[PDB]
């Protein structure tokens, strides 16, 4: 598929300025950084969980394995 036969579009007016008449990385604070946060706090509660969960299991696992090696002070009290 090429250009000129994608869709039946009507009544949309767009306005844009040359790259040289504007700023590249504008308003890092006014709108920039906020949205970055507007995002970290939007998925953290959806992504983090299973990862955190994984972690606990990784730890439990390693710790347990590393315990089942050491001897029990009482396997021989005689």
């Amino acid at each position: 598929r090429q250009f000129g036969h994608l869709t039946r579009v009507r009544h949309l007016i767009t306005y844009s300025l040359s790259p040289f008449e504007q700023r590249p990385f504008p308003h890092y604070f006014s709108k920039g950084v906020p949205n970055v946060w507007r995002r970290l706090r939007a998925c953290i509660l959806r992504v983090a969980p299973p990862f955190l969960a994984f972690y606990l299991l990784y730890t439990w696992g390693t710790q347990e394995f590393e315990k089942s090696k050491r001897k029990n002070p009482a396997a021989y009290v005689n």
């Binding site: 250009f3 000129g4 579009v9 009544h11 007016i13 767009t14 306005y15 844009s16 040289f20």
Partner: protein, 442 residues
């Protein structure tokens, strides 16, 4: 030829103790045309004032206090004289064409209009709805909306960006007052010019004007002419899309120098090189204007036009093509390629003709009385005096190749253009692309 030019009568000019400049060109023609040309346009309006000048135009004729509608109309018709006029962004005018046996009568009629329009609270309300309609007709002329949109974005955020007719809201609500407010603020002698051409003799004109234009300046403001706020150009685009239309319209342009500037000649000569096409031509062999040739060989468009529209201190040097939904791209590609070629590798063989074609226009620019008057009217108003063909000649009779390049490239190369396009324009590439179509991979 050179003699023909040399033997072309000089254009008499003289200001009044008022401020009005009265100029003219005496010919012989039993007929003639006289009119006043105002230093007023839509450019001079406000966000709430905009449209006045136009609302005003539609009433200028409908009668004065000194002589109501029924009469004014009757009196002009009755003498076989023609009254017509217009208004742009920086230039308005009203002109009449009669038998030079009526300079005095015409002259009086004129004045009576630019000074006492009835502004009948009852007439106004009528034209109000006439415009709102007339406006909705100007609309489907995609050839004009496109230019408006061009200006809009080209000079976005400035007085120029506003269209000469104005928003429907304004027209729906301008007050009998506002109109008067617009008239008494811009129609002043210092900014007006009374010009003529025909069998008329200057003196009879002067006096006649000096007699019906009894204006009197007290303070210094009245006597002085206010300069407008500069208008910022902006490399940008605006896309009014609708695959519902039969074909698309495109217009791209860079900022222009402005009347005062000389290069407007070299630059005027360059456009003569790319010229214009139109499916009713007979020429797959068109001298240069490859854009036209190419347009014919590869069926690139329905037509196109090169233009150097200019204003007081700015302008627009660009081009505009009408094309089918599917050939928009190549057309733009090929054209935009010509500008580069134009200012990067032009030839004498080209400029030579360029000139000639101009000179032929330059001259037919004055075919008749009405048109001549238009020059005097304008020339004075925008240049300061009159430029005789004899002059325009030299100005543009000494433009060589290297001159075109140097200039065109001075105004076109790697500049951020201003494009506009209504209709089925899905195929028109993004700004970035048409942008980098502004520098040749020399």
């Amino acid at each position: 030829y050179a003699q023909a030019l040399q033997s072309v009568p000089e254009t008499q000019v003289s200001q009044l103790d008022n401020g009005v400049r009265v100029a003219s060109e005496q010919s012989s023609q039993p007929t003639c045309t006289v009119g006043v040309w105002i230093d007023a346009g839509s450019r001079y309006e406000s966000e709430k004032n905009n449209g006045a000048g136009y609302f005003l135009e539609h009433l200028a004729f409908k009668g004065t206090k000194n002589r109501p509608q029924n009469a004014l109309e009757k009196e002009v018709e009755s003498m076989g004289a023609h009254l017509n006029a217009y208004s742009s962004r920086e230039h308005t005018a009203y002109y009449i064409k009669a038998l030079s046996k009526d300079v005095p009568k015409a002259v009086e009629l004129l004045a009576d209009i630019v000074q006492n329009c009835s502004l009948e609270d009852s007439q106004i309300e009528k034209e109000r709805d006439v415009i709102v309609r007339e406006l909705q007709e100007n609309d489907t002329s995609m050839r004009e909306v496109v230019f408006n949109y061009l200006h809009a974005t080209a000079f976005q955020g400035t007085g120029l960006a506003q269209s000469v007719e104005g928003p429907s809201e304004n027209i729906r609500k301008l007050s009998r007052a506002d109109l008067t407010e617009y008239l008494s603020t811009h129609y002043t002698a210092p900014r007006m010019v009374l010009a003529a051409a025909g069998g008329v003799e200057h003196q009879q004109l002067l006096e006649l004007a000096q007699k019906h234009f009894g204006g009197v300046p007290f303070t210094y403001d009245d006597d002085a002419v206010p300069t407008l706020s500069k208008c910022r150009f902006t490399g940008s685009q605006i896309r009014h899309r609708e695959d519902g239309l039969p074909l698309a319209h495109v217009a791209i342009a860079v900022e222009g120098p402005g009347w005062a500037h000389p290069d407007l000649v070299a630059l005027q000569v360059a456009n003569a090189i790319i010229g214009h096409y139109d499916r009713t031509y007979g020429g797959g062999l068109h001298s240069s204007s490859p854009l036209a040739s190419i347009a014919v060989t590869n069926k690139l468009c329905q037509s196109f036009q090169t233009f150097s529209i200019c204003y007081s201190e700015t302008g627009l040097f660009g081009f505009y093509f009408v094309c089918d939904r599917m050939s928009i791209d190549d057309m733009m590609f090929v054209l935009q390629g010509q500008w580069m070629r134009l200012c990067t590798s032009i030839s004498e063989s080209e400029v030579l003709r360029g000139k000639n074609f101009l000179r032929n226009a330059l001259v037919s620019h004055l075919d008749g009385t009405t048109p001549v008057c238009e020059d005097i009217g304008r020339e004075l108003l925008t240049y300061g005096r009159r430029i005789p063909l004899e002059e325009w000649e030299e100005r543009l009779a000494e433009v060589d190749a290297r001159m075109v390049r140097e200039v065109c490239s001075k105004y076109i190369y790697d500049q951020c253009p201003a494009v506009a396009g209504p209709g089925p324009i899905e195929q028109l590439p993004d700004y970035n692309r048409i942008r980098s179509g502004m520098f040749w991979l020399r």
